Amino acid sequence: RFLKVKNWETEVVLTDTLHLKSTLETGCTEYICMGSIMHPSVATKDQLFPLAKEFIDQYYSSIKRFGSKAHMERLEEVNKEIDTTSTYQLKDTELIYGAKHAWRNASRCVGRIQWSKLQVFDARDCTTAHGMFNYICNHVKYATNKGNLRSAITIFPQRTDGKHDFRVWNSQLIRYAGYKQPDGSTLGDPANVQFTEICIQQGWKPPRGRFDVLPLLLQANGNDPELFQIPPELVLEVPIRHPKFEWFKDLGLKWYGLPAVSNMLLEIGGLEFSACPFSGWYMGTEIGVRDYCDNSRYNILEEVAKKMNLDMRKTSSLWKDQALVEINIAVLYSFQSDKVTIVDHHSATESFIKHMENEYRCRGGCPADWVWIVPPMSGSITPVFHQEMLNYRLTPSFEYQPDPWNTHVWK
Amino acid sequence: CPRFLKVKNWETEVVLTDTLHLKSTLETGCTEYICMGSIMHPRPEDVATKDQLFPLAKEFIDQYYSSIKRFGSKAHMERLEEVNKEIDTTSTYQLKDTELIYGAKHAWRNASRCVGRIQWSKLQVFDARDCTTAHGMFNYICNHVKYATNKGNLRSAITIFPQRTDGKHDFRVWNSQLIRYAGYKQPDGSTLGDPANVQFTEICIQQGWKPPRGRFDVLPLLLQANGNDPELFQIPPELVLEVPIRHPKFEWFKDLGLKWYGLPAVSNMLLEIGGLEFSACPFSGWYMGTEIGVRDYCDNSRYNILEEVAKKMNLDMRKTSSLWKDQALVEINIAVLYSFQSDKVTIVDHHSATESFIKHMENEYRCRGGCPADWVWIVPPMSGSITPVFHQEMLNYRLTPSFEYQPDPWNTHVWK
Numbered sequence: 097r098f099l100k101v102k103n104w105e106t107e108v109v110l111t112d113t114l115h116l117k118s119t120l121e122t123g124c125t126e127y128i129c130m131g132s133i134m135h136p137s138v139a140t141k142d143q144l145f146p147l148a149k150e151f152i153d154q155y156y157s158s159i160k161r162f163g164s165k166a167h168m169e170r171l172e173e174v175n176k177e178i179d180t181t182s183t184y185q186l187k188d189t190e191l192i193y194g195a196k197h198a199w200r201n202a203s204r205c206v207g208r209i210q211w212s213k214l215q216v217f218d219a220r221d222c223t224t225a226h227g228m229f230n231y232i233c234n235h236v237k238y239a240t241n242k243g244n245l246r247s248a249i250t251i252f253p254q255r256t257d258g259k260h261d262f263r264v265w266n267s268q269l270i271r272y273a274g275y276k277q278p279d280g281s282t283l284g285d286p287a288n289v290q291f292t293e294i295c296i297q298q299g300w301k302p303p304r305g306r307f308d309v310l311p312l313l314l315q316a317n318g319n320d321p322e323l324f325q326i327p328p329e330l331v332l333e334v335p336i337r338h339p340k341f342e343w344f345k346d347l348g349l350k351w352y353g354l355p356a357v358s359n360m361l362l363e364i365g366g367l368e369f370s371a372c373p374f375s376g377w378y379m380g381t382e383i384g385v386r387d388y389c390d391n392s393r394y395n396i397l398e399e400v401a402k403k404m405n406l407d408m409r410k411t412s413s414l415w416k417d418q419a420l421v422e423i424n425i426a427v428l429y430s431f432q433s434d435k436v437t438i439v440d441h442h443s444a445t446e447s448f449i450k451h452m453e454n455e456y457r458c459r460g461g462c463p464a465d466w467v468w469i470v471p472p473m474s475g476s477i478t479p480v481f482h483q484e485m486l487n488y489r490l491t492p493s494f495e496y497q498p499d500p501w502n503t504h505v506w507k
Numbered sequence: 508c509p510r511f512l513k514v515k516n517w518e519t520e521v522v523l524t525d526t527l528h529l530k531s532t533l534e535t536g537c538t539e540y541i542c543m544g545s546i547m548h549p550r551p552e553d554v555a556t557k558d559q560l561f562p563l564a565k566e567f568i569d570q571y572y573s574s575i576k577r578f579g580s581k582a583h584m585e586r587l588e589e590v591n592k593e594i595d596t597t598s599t600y601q602l603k604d605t606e607l608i609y610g611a612k613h614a615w616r617n618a619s620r621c622v623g624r625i626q627w628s629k630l631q632v633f634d635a636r637d638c639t640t641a642h643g644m645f646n647y648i649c650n651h652v653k654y655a656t657n658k659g660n661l662r663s664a665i666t667i668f669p670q671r672t673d674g675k676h677d678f679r680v681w682n683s684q685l686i687r688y689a690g691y692k693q694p695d696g697s698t699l700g701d702p703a704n705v706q707f708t709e710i711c712i713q714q715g716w717k718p719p720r721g722r723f724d725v726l727p728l729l730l731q732a733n734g735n736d737p738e739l740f741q742i743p744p745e746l747v748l749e750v751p752i753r754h755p756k757f758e759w760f761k762d763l764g765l766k767w768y769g770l771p772a773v774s775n776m777l778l779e780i781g782g783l784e785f786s787a788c789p790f791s792g793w794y795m796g797t798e799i800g801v802r803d804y805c806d807n808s809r810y811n812i813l814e815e816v817a818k819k820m821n822l823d824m825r826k827t828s829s830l831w832k833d834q835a836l837v838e839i840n841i842a843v844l845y846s847f848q849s850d851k852v853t854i855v856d857h858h859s860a861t862e863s864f865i866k867h868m869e870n871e872y873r874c875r876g877g878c879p880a881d882w883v884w885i886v887p888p889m890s891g892s893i894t895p896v897f898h899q900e901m902l903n904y905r906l907t908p909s910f911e912y913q914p915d916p917w918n919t920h921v922w923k
């Protein structure tokens with residue numbers, strides 16, 4: 097059946113037909129909704145063929161050639177390859193289409209208006225961790241583009257037997273280290289304390305600073321991972337200052353310009369790309385709200401409210417909310433002053449509503465996760481707060497996967 | 508369906524285990540393939556038959572006798588027997604006063620969209636099931652408002668009017684809330700007052716209300732007893748406590764002429780207890796500041812004051828990345844909390860309320876086996892991730908007794 101979504105501010109109603117084409121589960125049932133659960137819970141020739149067939153079918157439907165001679169040949173081509181080799185290889189055109197549509201189907205991504213402008217780097221000929229490092233450096237250099245950031249994904253060889261996996265062990269390509277101090281506290285980024293310990297334990301010489309770029313830790317073909325330092329001229333960073341508060345620069349805050357998720361799994365046509373680092377540009381709140389002001393991250397709210405001279409004795413002064421707005425003004429001002437691409441949550445959510453309109457008209461829907469789409473501050477003064485959304489799982493897709501250090505049989 | 512489900516807090520690492528979900532009784536709207544968790548609302552002449560009513564009454568009576576540690580007792584089996592006979596001979600049954608009070612408190616406790624549930628057991632229940640006329644409803648509602656307001660030391664309360672019988676004799680409060688401000692559409696398309704209330708305001712005017720046509724006019728009560736046409740009553744103004752909004756720092760803020768009423772009182776929901784349907788059950792608590800400061804004042808479709816406040820703050824308003832909206836929103840919400848506290852009218856900030864709810868949720872998990880919660884509604888509409896609930900995984904499911912939505916009465920009423 098058709099489903100309607102209403103925007104309660106504009107009264108616009110859209111009609112979702114696209115959800116009828118999903119087949120993966122959400123985790124909800126008729127009686128329990130798991131919409132706020134962050135993670136709700138190796139193929140064979142038998143499982144693999146219908147998945148391949150479905151993906152080839154939708155690809156040739158997208159290029160307006162369904163049932164063509166090319167379509168029929170590809171289906172037969174893929175048939176004997178799965179049969180004779182227990183897997184199959186995507187054509188270049190299919191790889192690019194599959195990566196763009198995995199972005200397009202990412203229900204948690206507010207940046208999807210850009211989905212078809214994605215640079216795809218085919219790295220399926222990679223065999224070693226040195227090769228992976230070379231591919232990753234080129235990605236970072238291309239996507240950074242001197243501050244005019246460009247969306248990119250680099251796709252390493254697919255999973256075969258589960259024993260020869262390609263994995264980027266870093267959760268993101270560029271992150272700051274985290275150090276557990278003698279006096280029990282934490283220097284740097286606390287969310288990376290464990291990973292930083294694994295890099296130290298592998299030979300990394302930590303400068304033990306507050307913003308130390310972590311080395312890369314790269315696993316090729318199931319071997320033990322190897323450390324590599326990204327050349328510093330490739331790591332673009334932004335000193336954070338405030339347009340009105342000249343004391344803000346004295347806080348000593350910086351961040352990196354390139355957000356690049358490297359720990360997810362790209363599923364296309366039943367194939368699993370366990371190493372597929374992808375990157376875009378930041379929404380300001382990612383840095384200013386979550387990275388800086390989470391109690392479990394850099395946790396700077398009290399310090400800023402200190403130099404703002406705010407009364408911090410009771411919650412109802414909203415001192416936290418005041419300091420939060422100023423932190424996020426500075427992040428946007430800093431990136432913009434340095435001509436590094438960044439989007440504020442007002443522009444981003446507005447673009448996403450426009451994206452939603454587009455997708456409903458030309459595609460019949462747009463899967464979207466309100467819990468992730470609504471920004472972590474000022475929710476209801478952004479237009480996505482008032483937008484009903486339907487969440488469902490379409491393929492090709494990005495999926496979560498286990499941390500590699502919980503599964504890697506060392507040697 | 509799995510027996511144990513785990514929820515995690517991603518800020519504190521605390522893991523909780525839910526078994527209460529196995530008692531869920533009605534549908535969420537989600538399926539195995541689609542989640543409707545952000546959908547706001549996923550015939551009234553149809554009433555429960557004898558055969559639908561029997562198991563629903565037994566379920567609730569069993570639950571009540573279990574709560575009082577008398578499950579399987581003589582009084583439990585006798586009450587089952589007496590209820591079953593009543594349904595057989597009359598097609599319905601009447602709740603004892605103790606069961607009515609238990610059911611109302613538990614409908615609140617079960618309200619997955621309510622962040623204020625740490626208070627659920629402290630609820631004053633007024634039994635108005637002997638009411639017969641709209642004048643009597645007005646008396647009961649006035650007594651509710653005065654008790655709940657308590658000169659600013661607000662007390663949560665519910666007043667329960669007679670249950671549905673055949674569906675042609677419903678009691679309804681036509682107001683969605685007991686205290687709201689009127690909205691007036693102008694010929695030029697602008698709106699005076701609260702634009703959310705234009706439809707209901709026009710109904711009141713058609714029913715005889717003489718509108719003062721101001722920015723903050725308390726609407727009359729529009730009250731329907733026993734399925735008759737509804738009747739208009741003016742709430743005595745001395746019973747409507749109101750707070751003028753001023754700012755601790757910006758002396759010009761009072762010059763905006765803003766105020767709000769102290770008592771939030773929902774009057775359009777349906778209370779279901781043991782299969783009985785209480786279509787008029789106004790309930791009231793006290794406000795979380797963001798309800799006024801963020802939604803009532805700053806939604807574009809409501810009073811929409813961000814622009815005017817930003818001007819008086821002399822903020823750069825040409826680019827959105829100055830965050831001038833965010834900056835003015837904080838100052839508006841500071842003024843709302845400051846004005847209420849200064850006048851000694853109960854209010855809770857969104858930091859304190861969400862912290863209390865986490866503690867409530869943890870206690871419910873430990874003592875009750877779970878706590879249904881709707882993240883989309885629990886997380887406040889500003890500063891989301893600097894409140895603890897943002898980081899809390901929540902399971903949403905529908906337990907009974909419950910508060911439910913029901914059609915708007917003007918869409919279903921048969922005019923005499």
Ligand code: HEM
Pocket residue numbers: 195199202204205206207208210214247248249374375376377378379382439444468494
């Ligand atoms: C182009 C600019 C982009 C912007 C402004 C943007 C914005 C965002 C934001 C704010 C989130 C939430 C992140 C979090 O809170 O952890 C997100 C999630 C996500 N984005 Fe985008 N994004 C962009 C590009 C991309 C690209 C290029 C891809 C893949 C090709 C992508 C795929 C995803 C996925 C899979 C998620 C979900 C991540 C998860 O579940 O942890 N995004 N995006």
Ligand code: HEM
Pocket residue numbers: 611615618620621622623624626630663664665790791792793794795798855860884910
């Ligand atoms: C005592 C202090 C209370 C506080 C601080 C509080 C807080 C809230 C808030 C902030 C909401 C969201 C409202 C909205 O965004 O429209 C809400 C919803 C709700 N509350 Fe509470 N509440 C309180 C008392 C009560 C009481 C006494 C009841 C019933 C006996 C109740 C039942 C509900 C229900 C059913 C909803 C859902 C409303 C809807 O779906 O429109 N609450 N509450």
Ligand SMILES: Cc1cc(N)nc(CCc2cc(CCN(C)C)cc(F)c2F)c1
Pocket residue numbers: 268270271354355356357374375376377378379382386387
């Ligand atoms: C493609 C893309 C674009 C964009 N704008 N944002 C992202 C997410 C980026 C990202 C997420 C995290 C999770 C941390 N979370 C707990 C707050 C950590 C990072 F270091 C990081 F860079 C991806």
Ligand SMILES: Cc1cc(N)nc(CCc2cc(CCN(C)C)cc(F)c2F)c1
Pocket residue numbers: 623684686687770771772773790791792793794795798802803
């Ligand atoms: C018992 C109780 C306590 C509490 N703190 N809040 C409530 C909700 C009150 C309420 C809701 C609405 C819906 C409009 N929404 C978009 C903001 C309008 C109102 F006028 C109103 F008073 C109930």
Ligand SMILES: C[C@H](O)[C@H](O)[C@H]1CNc2nc(N)[nH]c(=O)c2N1
Pocket residue numbers: 132133134467468469517897898899900901
């Ligand atoms: C419990 C809840 O699912 C969790 O905190 C989510 C909420 N929404 C989010 N939204 C985004 N964009 N990113 C996040 O990490 C989260 N965390």
Ligand SMILES: C[C@H](O)[C@H](O)[C@H]1CNc2nc(N)[nH]c(=O)c2N1
Pocket residue numbers: 104481482483484485544545546547883884885
């Ligand atoms: C579309 C979305 O469900 C809608 O805007 C919701 C979001 N969360 C909410 N949360 C509360 N407390 N009150 C609301 O009215 C809403 N509205």
Ligand SMILES: [Zn+2]
Pocket residue numbers: 124128129130131537541542543544
């Ligand atoms: Zn759901």
